[PDB]
Structure formats: C-alpha cells, structure tokens
Amino acid sequence: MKFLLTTAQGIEDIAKREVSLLLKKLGISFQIEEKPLGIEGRLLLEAEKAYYVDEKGRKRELSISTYLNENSRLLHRVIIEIASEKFNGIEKDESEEALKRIKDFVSSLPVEQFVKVSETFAVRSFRKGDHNITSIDIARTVGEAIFERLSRFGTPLVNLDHPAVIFRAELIKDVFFLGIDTTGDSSLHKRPWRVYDHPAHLKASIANAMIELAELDGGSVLDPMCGSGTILIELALRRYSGEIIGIEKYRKHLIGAEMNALAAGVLDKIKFIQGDATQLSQYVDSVDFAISNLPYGSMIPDLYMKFFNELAKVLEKRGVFITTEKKAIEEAIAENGFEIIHHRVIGHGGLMVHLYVVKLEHHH
Ligand SMILES: C[S@@+](CC[C@H](N)C(=O)[O-])C[C@H]1O[C@@H](n2cnc3c(N)ncnc32)[C@H](O)[C@@H]1O
C-alpha cells in the first residue's frame, strides 16, 4: 500500500523519522520518500500490509492509516495513494485543456477498487501555484470523472457533507495527486485542547518539530514568550519527565495558555508566569532548554537583542527558536555569545519562517 503523508513544508525529515519509529513498532517493512516528485510538505510511504491472526485463527489486516492518524504528532493528513503524476506544463495550459488532462487521467484510475460503491463519497480539492483553473474547477472535474467511472459498476451516491469516503485531489505546481483521505475534514494538527486561539499561535505539528530538534534529555524546558502555551502543552502531552515553564508578557494570553493547558489535562505539569523576557534572569536562574515561537512584528531588533542577552545568563544546553526576522535574530545571536548549530526554513501559515537551534559558544 502507498500513502501520501502530509506535514508542514520544511519538516519532512522530522516527520519521516517519527513515522519510521512508529512503523518499526508494528514490525512491518516500509520505505519513506521525502518530498515525492519534488513537492514540499509531503512524504510517500510504501509499506507492506499489516497482517495478524485474529480470534478465529484467520489472517486479519491492521489499518496502517488509523495507527498513524492516532499516534503521529507531526503529520497533517494520512492519504491512501491512488495515483501521483507530473502533468508537465499544466500550469501554462488553457483552462479547457488542463481540465481535460485531469478528467482523462482520473477516468483511467481504478477508483471502484477504493470504495464500496454502496458508500457515499465526496471530492475535496487543494490547489497551489499559477494555474488557469481553480480548486472548484478541479473538484468538479475530478468529481465528474469519478461519478462517471463508478456508474459503470453500480449506483454511486455523493454526499458532500458526510461522505463515507473522501477522495482528495491536489494539484501543486505540475503535480497531480488523487487519494483517499483517511484523516477526514479536520487535519491532525487541529487540537481539541485549543479553546483559546492566539492570533499568532504555532501549529501543533511544528511545535513538535521544535521539540524533536531540541533533543531533550529530561532537563528543564522554558518557553519565555509562550503565548497560548502550544509548545509547552504539546511537551506535557508527550508525558515529558522534566520541568516545564512558560513566561508570557500579556495577561490575556497567559490566561489563554492556562485555559488551553487545563483543556488538555496538563495544567499541573506546567509553571506559567506573567513576565517580561527581556528580564528573564529575574524569573529564573538556570534552565536547560529554551524553545519559543518569537514575535514576528523596528522594535524587534531591540526585543531580540535584550532577550538573547538575558538568555545567555540562564541557558545550560540548547535553544530552538522560530521567527520571520532573520536579520534581527542572527545579530542578537552573534552579539550575545551564541552559536547556530542548525538552521532550516519552514512554511507556517503561508509565511516562510526561520528555525534556529542555538547553544552558547563557550559551552563544550
Ligand atoms: C508568536 S507569539 C507565541 C505563540 C505561541 N507559540 C502559541 O502557540 O500560542 C509571541 C508571544 O510573545 C509574547 N511577547 C512579546 N514580547 C514579550 C516579552 N518581552 N516578554 C515575554 N513575552 C513577550 C507576545 O505577547 C506573544 O504571545
């Protein structure tokens, strides 16, 4: 079976690693390709089917997609792949021609093998790039092609709202994909604990990426500009053994973080402090790790300069930070005795953000 596994652009490798460890626990053979056909935010998983012997002494199949939906913290969607292909030049094609290519391609796929045509279906589409067609166009054409093909085998019923089966069709640049979305209408990053919605909140998948990149070892973890508490809540939900501390400047957001942490059942796991990170050394003397989604915003250069001056007084091991302001953070890091030991770019809410892992230059 082939699966398309989606995640944030720029963390594909971290997601592959998580999925690999999860599947290794099942005992199955598998291969994972990062960025199939060049497309960011995707993995292509090729796995053996997961068989066991059930209470009747019969071979029975375990659902790989349910296992991954239930256990992954880095993935957005788990989609059973029907087909992925390059439609070379489709960005330039006129509307009529582009849709024709898509309809003809889909008409050729054995979709009747991925739905009991008693079941209701709908088509969800996603489009990204410069096309002469829209999401709506794609969903209609694909929807038409699948209804027509299914009608060759039975009587198919659409249900747009509560389909039993969602076919997801995505066109990103030159690349077309069709699959069965096992995840459903809410992506895996939607957390039911998020009762307070901070307007610059970090998606949970990227929070977990930052945690993985810190390489935590049970030492104390501070988010000194914590907002609604996402990073610390995801960490407590990992049953982290170590101390967890959040500091946030504005009351409203700090109370939002408390409410989110209560909703998640981990309020007892986190110390939440209202405070100023440019004064960090007043609130703590020593922390092992700092992990923060910094404000993206002048005033930024000076906020970062003072914060990294204070962080230098208290940090023992590593910091992991995300920001849009590459130049401000890079200067604050260099002026304050820090060294960058990893950098990458991540796609977050249609922004390119920069992630850095840092340590103090003098620590060996
Ligand atoms: C991008 S948001 C954090 C969002 C958090 N990752 C979440 O998911 O909710 C940056 C936060 O830094 C806080 N902040 C700004 N200046 C601060 C300062 N001097 N001290 C502490 N927090 C500050 C803001 O109030 C804001 O909540």
Curated annotation (Swiss-Prot):
Quick one: which residues bind S-adenosyl-L-methionine?
Answer: H198, P199, A200, H201, L202, S228, G229, T230, E248, D276, A277, N293
**What superkingdom does the record give?**
Archaea
Look up the EC number in the record and give it.
Answer: 2.1.1.256
Looking at the record, the residues that make up the THUMP domain are: 69-182
Q: Which gene encodes it?
A: trm14
The record lists the organism as: Pyrococcus furiosus (strain ATCC 43587 / DSM 3638 / JCM 8422 / Vc1)
Predominant cellular place of this UniProt entry's protein: cytoplasm
Name it.
tRNA (guanine(6)-N2)-methyltransferase
The record's annotation in InterPro entries points to: RlmKL-like_Mtase, RlmKL-like_Mtase_CS, SAM-dependent_MTases_sf, THUMP_dom, Trm14-like
Give a short account of what the protein does.
S-adenosyl-L-methionine-dependent methyltransferase that catalyzes the methylation of the guanosine nucleotide at position 6 (m2G6) in tRNA(Phe).
Entry GO terms, CC? cytoplasm
Question: What keywords would UniProt list here?
Answer: Cytoplasm, Methyltransferase, RNA-binding, S-adenosyl-L-methionine, Transferase, tRNA processing
Task: Name the NCBIfam families on file.
Answer: Trm14_Thcoccales
Catalysed reactions listed for this entry? guanosine(6) in tRNA + S-adenosyl-L-methionine = N(2)-methylguanosine(6) in tRNA + S-adenosyl-L-homocysteine + H(+)
Give compartment(s): Cytoplasm
Q: How does it assemble?
A: Monomer in solution.
| Domain observations | Consists of an N-terminal THUMP domain fused to a catalytic Rossmann-fold MTase (RFM) domain.
